[PDB]
Symmetry: C3
Subunit: 139 residues, 3 copies
């Protein structure tokens, strides 16, 4: 099948720091690299489909947020990666296919996707990281 973009885009942001951490300006979600242990939560992403009674709901990551079957937040330097797993909170069945995370069943799903650290990465370089997901459907 293939992804058809049809929806809005959610960006999950995380600033990764060392132990001595200097917050400058507006409050922003930050973690020290020591907090990037396996399964550590990064954040939730709300998803609400409508008009999808006969389509499989899908999310597509930006090109700089995936490599084959793996997802990652990408540093603002465009290089450094923070690998993550993406999981619905209702434990419904989804499939990953080259940047696309799509629901196995048709229907206008409403849910919450959690983004978690995939494998211990406590040596991740400091930086401002982002994962960008766009709604659509899989056919």
């Amino acid at each position: 099948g293939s992804f058809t973009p049809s929806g809005t885009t959610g960006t999950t942001k995380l600033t990764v720091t060392e132990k001595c951490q200097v917050r400058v300006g507006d409050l922003t979600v930050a973690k020290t690299r020591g907090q990037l242990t396996d399964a550590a939560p990064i954040g939730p992403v709300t998803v609400q489909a409508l008009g999808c009674d006969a389509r499989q709901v899908a999310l597509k990551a930006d090109t700089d947020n995936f490599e084959q079957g793996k997802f990652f937040l990408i540093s603002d330097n465009n290089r450094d990666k923070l690998y993550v797993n993406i999981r619905p909170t209702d434990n419904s069945a989804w499939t990953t296919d080259n940047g696309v995370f799509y629901k196995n069943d048709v229907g206008s799903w409403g849910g919450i996707i959690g983004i978690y650290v995939d494998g211990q990465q406590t040596n991740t370089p400091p930086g401002n990281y982002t994962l960008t997901l766009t709604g659509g459907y899989w056919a």
Copy 2:
């Protein structure tokens, strides 16, 4: 005539989708392409001029948002256009000149500019569209 940039910039954004629409994250302005009917409102843009008692208030569209006396929101990839009309909500008269929408008389105008779909465009490709307007003043 010429436009002098002097003010701030308003960005009008719209995400166009198909009927099966998947909203991800925070609520943002989205429409299905079927909702892109003639005169459908894209959004308001508030304008307030100060110190322009002797100048003609003006809004300049970004280069990528105008051509041939026509304004349009443009997709993120610069390819796809969504043509619009730009209209103040009061009785005031304005002129379009090469990407600049300027008021026909001088004065520190304040008001609401509506951006509307110009001609039914229900086949617009899904994507993120933007129209950027910068305040300033115009003169011949």
Copy 3:
């Protein structure tokens, strides 16, 4: 010594206009060029350090925001500078070193850094100016 980025980034923005000023869309920080008098405030920057009991808290300006021990907001096109002084409100001692503004003492400082116009610059060209500061620490 040298700077280690470790913290979040604060962006200070200002739109400079002429006397006839046309605000478009949401309110943003704007000043006429005539308001760019000596020491005119551009804005505050809240700073809170944690885990730095043994390091010197530091802010590093983007490469396009510093020169010759001078800091400045820069216009969108990277040409026009608006020189500023950066000063903590508690008048603690800090040092400037090639784009880094670091605290002379060690410790997890919590404070407010004010950004102010350095010398009257009432001829600054209208445009959008930005100063970007990143949190980290200085080490010898």
